[PDB]
């Protein structure tokens, strides 16, 4: 099931970083609505994004 190998491959990111690309990408908040959302900053999320995005090509990649 392919919302099964999403969630496993979330499960190995930092929790606030799932919570952040749910929110941008499935739910299609802004960065600065998640900012919002998650008690952040803009900048914040920022990173955090792309810190998730490499993880994330790092197992999938592997």
Same mark, same amino acid.
Request: hydrophobic share 50%; net charge neutral.
């Given at each position: ?8 491959l ?13 929110? #941008?990408?499935?739910v299609? +908040?802004?960065? %600065?609505?998640? !900012? ?5 900053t ?8 792309? #810190?998730?995005?490499?993880? +994330?090509?790092? %197992?999938?990649? !592997?």
């Amino acid at each position: 099931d392919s919302v099964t190998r999403m969630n496993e491959l979330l499960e190995i990111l930092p929790a606030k970083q799932r919570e952040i690309l749910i929110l #941008r990408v499935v739910v299609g +908040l802004s960065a %600065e609505e998640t !900012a919002a959302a998650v008690g952040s900053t803009t900048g914040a999320v920022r990173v955090a994004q792309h #810190r998730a995005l490499q993880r +994330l090509k790092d %197992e999938i990649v !592997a």
